[PDB]
Amino acid sequence: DKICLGHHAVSNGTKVNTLTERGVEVVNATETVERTNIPRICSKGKRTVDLGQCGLLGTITGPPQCDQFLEFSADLIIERREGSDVCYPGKFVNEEALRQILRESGGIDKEAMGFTYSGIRTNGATSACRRSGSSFYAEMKWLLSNTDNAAFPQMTKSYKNTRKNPALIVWGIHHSVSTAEQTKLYGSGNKLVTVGSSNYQQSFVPSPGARPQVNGLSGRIDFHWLMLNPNDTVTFSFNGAFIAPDRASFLRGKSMGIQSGVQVDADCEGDCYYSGGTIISNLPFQNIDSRAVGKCPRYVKQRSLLLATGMKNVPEGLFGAIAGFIENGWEGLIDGWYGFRHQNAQGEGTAADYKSTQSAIDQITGKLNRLIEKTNQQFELIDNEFTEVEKQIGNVINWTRDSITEVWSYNAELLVAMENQHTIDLADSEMDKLYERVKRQLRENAEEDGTGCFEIFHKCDDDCMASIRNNTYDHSKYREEAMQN
Amino acid sequence: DKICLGHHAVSNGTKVNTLTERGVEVVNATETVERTNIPRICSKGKRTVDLGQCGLLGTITGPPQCDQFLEFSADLIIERREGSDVCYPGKFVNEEALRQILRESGGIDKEAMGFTYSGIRTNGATSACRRSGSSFYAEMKWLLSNTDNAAFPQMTKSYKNTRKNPALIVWGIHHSVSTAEQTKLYGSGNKLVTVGSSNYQQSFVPSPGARPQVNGLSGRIDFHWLMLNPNDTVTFSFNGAFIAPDRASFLRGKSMGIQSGVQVDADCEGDCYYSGGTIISNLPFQNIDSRAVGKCPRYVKQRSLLLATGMKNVPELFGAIAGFIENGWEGLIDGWYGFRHQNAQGEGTAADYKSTQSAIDQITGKLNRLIEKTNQQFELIDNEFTEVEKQIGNVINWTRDSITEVWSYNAELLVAMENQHTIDLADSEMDKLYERVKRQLRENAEEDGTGCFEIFHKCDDDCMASIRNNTYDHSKYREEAMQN
Amino acid sequence: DKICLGHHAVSNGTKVNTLTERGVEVVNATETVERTNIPRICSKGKRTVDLGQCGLLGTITGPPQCDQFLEFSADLIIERREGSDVCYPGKFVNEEALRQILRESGGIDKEAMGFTYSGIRTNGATSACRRSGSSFYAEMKWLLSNTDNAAFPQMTKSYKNTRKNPALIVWGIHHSVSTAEQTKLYGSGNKLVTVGSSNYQQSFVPSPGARPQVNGLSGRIDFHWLMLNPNDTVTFSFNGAFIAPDRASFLRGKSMGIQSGVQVDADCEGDCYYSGGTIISNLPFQNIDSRAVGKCPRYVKQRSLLLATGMKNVPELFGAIAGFIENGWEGLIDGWYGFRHQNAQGEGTAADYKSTQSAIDQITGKLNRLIEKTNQQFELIDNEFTEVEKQIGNVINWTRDSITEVWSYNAELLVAMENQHTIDLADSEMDKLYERVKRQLRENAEEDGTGCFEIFHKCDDDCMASIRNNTYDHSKYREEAMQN
Numbered sequence A: 001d002k003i004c005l006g007h008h009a010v011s012n013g014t015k016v017n018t019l020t021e022r023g024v025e026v027v028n029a030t031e032t033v034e035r036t037n038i039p040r041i042c043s044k045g046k047r048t049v050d051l052g053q054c055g056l057l058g059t060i061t062g063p064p065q066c067d068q069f070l071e072f073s074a075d076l077i078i079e080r081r082e083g084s085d086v087c088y089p090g091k092f093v094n095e096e097a098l099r100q101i102l103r104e105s106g107g108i109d110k111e112a113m114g115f116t117y118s119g120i121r122t123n124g125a126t127s128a129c130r131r132s133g134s135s136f137y138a139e140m141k142w143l144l145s146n147t148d149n150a151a152f153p154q155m156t157k158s159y160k161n162t163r164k165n166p167a168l169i170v171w172g173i174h175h176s177v178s179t180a181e182q183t184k185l186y187g188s189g190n191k192l193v194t195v196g197s198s199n200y201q202q203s204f205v206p207s208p209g210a211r212p213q214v215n216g217l218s219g220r221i222d223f224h225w226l227m228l229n230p231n232d233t234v235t236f237s238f239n240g241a242f243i244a245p246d247r248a249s250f251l252r253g254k255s256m257g258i259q260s261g262v263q264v265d266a267d268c269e270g271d272c273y274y275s276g277g278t279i280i281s282n283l284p285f286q287n288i289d290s291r292a293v294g295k296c297p298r299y300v301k302q303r304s305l306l307l308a309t310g311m312k313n314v315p316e317g318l319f320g321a322i323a324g325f326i327e328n329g330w331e332g333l334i335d336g337w338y339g340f341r342h343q344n345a346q347g348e349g350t351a352a353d354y355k356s357t358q359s360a361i362d363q364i365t366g367k368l369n370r371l372i373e374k375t376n377q378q379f380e381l382i383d384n385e386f387t388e389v390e391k392q393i394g395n396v397i398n399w400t401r402d403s404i405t406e407v408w409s410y411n412a413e414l415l416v417a418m419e420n421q422h423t424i425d426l427a428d429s430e431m432d433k434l435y436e437r438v439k440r441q442l443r444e445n446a447e448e449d450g451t452g453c454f455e456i457f458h459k460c461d462d463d464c465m466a467s468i469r470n471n472t473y474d475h476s477k478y479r480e481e482a483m484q485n
Numbered sequence B, C: 001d002k003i004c005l006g007h008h009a010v011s012n013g014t015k016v017n018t019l020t021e022r023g024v025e026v027v028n029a030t031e032t033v034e035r036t037n038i039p040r041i042c043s044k045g046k047r048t049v050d051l052g053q054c055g056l057l058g059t060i061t062g063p064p065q066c067d068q069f070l071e072f073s074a075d076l077i078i079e080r081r082e083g084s085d086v087c088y089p090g091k092f093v094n095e096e097a098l099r100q101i102l103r104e105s106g107g108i109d110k111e112a113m114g115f116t117y118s119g120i121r122t123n124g125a126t127s128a129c130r131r132s133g134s135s136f137y138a139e140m141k142w143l144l145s146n147t148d149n150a151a152f153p154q155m156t157k158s159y160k161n162t163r164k165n166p167a168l169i170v171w172g173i174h175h176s177v178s179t180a181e182q183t184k185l186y187g188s189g190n191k192l193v194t195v196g197s198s199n200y201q202q203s204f205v206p207s208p209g210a211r212p213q214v215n216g217l218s219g220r221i222d223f224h225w226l227m228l229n230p231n232d233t234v235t236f237s238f239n240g241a242f243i244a245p246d247r248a249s250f251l252r253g254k255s256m257g258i259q260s261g262v263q264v265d266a267d268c269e270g271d272c273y274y275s276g277g278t279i280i281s282n283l284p285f286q287n288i289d290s291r292a293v294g295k296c297p298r299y300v301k302q303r304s305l306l307l308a309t310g311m312k313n314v315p316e317l318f319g320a321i322a323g324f325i326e327n328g329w330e331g332l333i334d335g336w337y338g339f340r341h342q343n344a345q346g347e348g349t350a351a352d353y354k355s356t357q358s359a360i361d362q363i364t365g366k367l368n369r370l371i372e373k374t375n376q377q378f379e380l381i382d383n384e385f386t387e388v389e390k391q392i393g394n395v396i397n398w399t400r401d402s403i404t405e406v407w408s409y410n411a412e413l414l415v416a417m418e419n420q421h422t423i424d425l426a427d428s429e430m431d432k433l434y435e436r437v438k439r440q441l442r443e444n445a446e447e448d449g450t451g452c453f454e455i456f457h458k459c460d461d462d463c464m465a466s467i468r469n470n471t472y473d474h475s476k477y478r479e480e481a482m483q484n
């Protein structure tokens, strides 16, 4: 009569990596690196504004394509590649900083700045900024001389921020195609604009000259901006070539901005976005895109990092039981992880030990619950996919992102291998612990055969075997019949 | 007659986190994330100059509030929120870069540039820079036309650097409230400035215009600065609207610049500073301020990460602790592991010094390895008072948040891993003591299953003592014990 | 008659650091932090181009020292400290960004813009750019005026990028010594230069003024650059003080840019370069230069981190090594673990191949996993020769120091952890061998406590050999040994 101990096993198994070995077949494993993508912008539960053809900066100045976003409000702002910030040819200074400001703004709220004028024309328009006939930026005023070639009077206009949050102030310098046109619109003489506050202090002079035609015009209206603190006053002093602001902008609250090219899905929910869609995953790592934003798994270079969720698969190592003095595993033990297999006059019985199985299962389960977590830290865009940022700061950004990518790749690899080593050694420890427990139960009534079996030197029926398995065996009841050998 | 052996335990332990479980009670644990803060700037043994109402940049130009900091010398420079770089309204170009240059300069040393002026007037003053009545920047001079109008003659002034270290040259451009004021101060037509040294070059045209009233005045004097190399000659070609430099600045040595709002305490000593005070700690992590400077523990998001310094606590890997030994002994106060024998003379409970001192030395080794101090000093690249450019600020915040994530992860994983190996370590020591006793008794005792050894012969107190200090001889009792 | 289990040892081991102990002697160890460097630039099979006295930016403008590099092509670009971008005194705007663009460009390819001028001069030369006598930049034209004092007409020359890649458009602004010189060269009045396109706009103006002379000349010709997109059109509207471009530059492919001061060696091959030479190593870390570029081991502050490649050395966690086995056998030079038996035929000592090869395979796996090459190439964002802006330089230095801290911590923790698991691993193997012999002897032998087995029967040499190769039948001797 004998009672052997063993562990389960499967036919195929799954290879993993450890601290000492590469390609260890374990019974079960799960992936930690996300490779699956939702090719949509999951926007369920979030106020979403798809800008489309309106550029994010245009919402402050107001070209015809931005007429519906002049006072938008959203939790998720989507920039599109076909978006344009300007109707009249030009660009912004410190454009990317303002884009990053508006992505988190949660929307904008315009307020009249109270600029009245006397002695100049205030209805400059163009065929590029076309609404009905010929129009201009909805939030701006193209100030021209009162008549053709007349002298533009020296003016100075101020604005007080009576609110509790800073205001976004944008003005424009007009760059004519020639000095003759600048005199035609503003009169002869040098033109100068001065913008001053308590934190800002800059001056601007236009630059007449020929340029390649953009949208059909060779002039260039450029836009500049500042943040006016509460109770602070902004002052402009100008005598021509000045696009005056009409309404200031105030940030509503909180949001996040992404640049994408896939459709919006209001029935899907997500928190991690990139240009190709939404990354929905509980895994701690992802190998989709290093520039993902939101609450995302850490980007890593590796495509797959299998974490072992089971013992070493030994079909037909610190503690020497699994894949040790126990030659192989039991492919039929589908009842648990560790188990008993007895042979007596009734012969051949296989049961499972619930305590050790549930112990290893609880340990690996706690490990998975520790690794499968959420990073509540949100990251926003500092790069730009449609309009590349400056070369130097872009190289610094790329360098930093690559360094962090190296760090997280290392931490992910080392983490996976280490946890796999501890998993295998842990299951081994549980097998050896169960074996030691049975040896301690039988005491002097049985002997070890070296293969994990116990030679019981007395007669042990199915009730006696069941007495061994549930720790009700009393060695003194057999300490003489068994010890007669 | 039996001899048991076990481990110590306490009623109220300390819950820690491990690689495989959260809330494991251990006997003892220590904190690795610092939270206590000294509400003062510990500056003992350091030359400290509190700028107060004086701005760091003003020390180069010299407003009335910086007349005593014109040649300061310190190891720790402290910027205050009430500081101001100017008395006449204006601002510096590349102000933050110059601030970072002055923070680590160890002070400044001025030297007369030797500018003499024939013709033009050089005593321009204002009611914003008040000393005696109306004064100007002590290191600058306001050049004006000879009379109340007419012409300001074109002039060129050149300075040569006769030092071995670079010099700090700071000049100023004056922006009048209107064209009429510029014509009154310096003359009708265009005003032009030109600064040239090689590896530098620039021209400047003033921009008259109405600015908001700061200190009652609407003009704006904005300051520019270059760094002269040895033997390098700088030349200024101007004809008005030029704030001339009177003395150049030289960097003394090395210091550190912090921005705080708490008082200075020369009683305590510290090397890690921030706005709220001084972080004096030996712990490797801190959750006080992510922008701390100097030699600091690495900032982490977590506010508490308990490191286990004891075994698993079991009140009343290797399977001894919390395994076949059902529980621990709160009475065992002499050590971590011990014996408890039951014979004929009574009951005994002693402690084993080898295993206890072994585990204590091991966990002590972990402690010594973890509470390491980093000799890497980090400088200030942000500004709590005057916010930097939005783009470079977003990049700096982005990098700092990335590093914070890295160190938070490393701290969590380190704590959990060290706790796991600590519990497994103590368990291993218990198992090793048990196996040592088992091999020591040989065939004269048996295992009952709960960490005890039934001795099948009479074993008095001296026999138990022989078992404890490993002087027990099995052949002395083999003949009697074998019969059972 | 007894049979003992043991492990090897050496007289003088190597001390390493573990998670719980500093200075643990192990049998063998290997270095993980590289210090040795080849003091040459190993560019075997890379087509190098050593600029020498030519500056990297000059290859776009074409001073006399860059005449042979006007259309260079390479995979590794080496900048020297003696390199100069200019022959006439001047500099570049956004020079560092353009240098970084040219380092990874793989070379440049020039193409004639196709500019034709009328009524003006186009042969402006100088004695500083000395080819035959007085010359100028090969890729530039110095537009002047015919007589000593005429007037530069308002001109506008445009170019259209006809190729499917961006074009580098470098023009120049001339800054004269005085107003009289600028009027002598270009006429009189306010001179302006405008460069427009799709991603660009700007506004350039000269700056006449007194200036110290470099190379005997006080003028300053500065160069500004542009990146036209395919099908994009650039336009220049100028009226004087304009150094016109001649040919445009196109990036050939990809390359690497390093700054070094050592000779070039076409024999050795390397992928990691720094100012001192080439780092040829497979170790995961290096303490040579933190600014090394290419595919390098990660820089760390520590100079040496010894990885344990053997068991703990015990001369004369699982309790076997340095435990109930008192010491190791220096005479066991046949393997890691071995038997030492004593019977009647004499005294024997053999080695066990299973456990030895097992531990060797595990530690070999650790070495194969740690000794790994990083296929991530890092470019040059600093400048050892010219230096960059102070603010972006402080940000770059700050980020680099942070990453260096992270990799130093990870290196320390990695080495200590791997050493801990290695020692515990070999200990585990020894214990497993011991328990295998214990289970193998069944009831015919008894443990002695010091790692040996007292055999209670007569076991000759063939019986010992049967024990060593797992062919010992305990039933052969069970009746004989049971009687004792």
Ligand SMILES: *[C@@H]1O[C@H](CO)[C@@H](O)[C@H](O)[C@H]1NC(C)=O
Pocket (backbone or CB within 6 Å): A028, A029, A030, A309
């Ligand atoms: C394998 O592990 C995964 C963990 O994600 C678990 O969901 C699955 O049920 C496991 N399979 C078996 C057969 O235990």
Ligand SMILES: *[C@@H]1O[C@H](CO)[C@@H](O)[C@H](O)[C@H]1NC(C)=O
Pocket (backbone or CB within 6 Å): A388, A390, A391, A392, A394, A395, A398
């Ligand atoms: C940074 O990398 C992206 C791709 O990851 C590339 O498009 C961009 O051009 C890089 N930045 C610079 C300045 O080249």
Ligand SMILES: *[C@@H]1O[C@H](CO)[C@@H](O)[C@H](O)[C@H]1NC(C)=O
Pocket (backbone or CB within 6 Å): B028, B029, B030, B309
């Ligand atoms: C508990 O750990 C702390 C760690 O600082 C130590 O100071 C203290 O002495 C320990 N207490 C005991 C009873 O070991």
Ligand SMILES: *[C@@H]1O[C@H](CO)[C@@H](O)[C@H](O)[C@H]1NC(C)=O
Pocket (backbone or CB within 6 Å): B387, B389, B390, B391, B393, B394, B397
């Ligand atoms: C960076 O973070 C600090 C607080 O941590 C904040 O005061 C500052 O405004 C942030 N920078 C930017 C550009 O938003």
Ligand SMILES: *[C@@H]1O[C@H](CO)[C@@H](O)[C@H](O)[C@H]1NC(C)=O
Pocket (backbone or CB within 6 Å): C389, C390, C391, C393, C394, C397
């Ligand atoms: C950055 O460090 C290098 C040395 O590693 C030094 O030469 C350089 O001056 C530093 N940068 C700044 C801006 O100080």
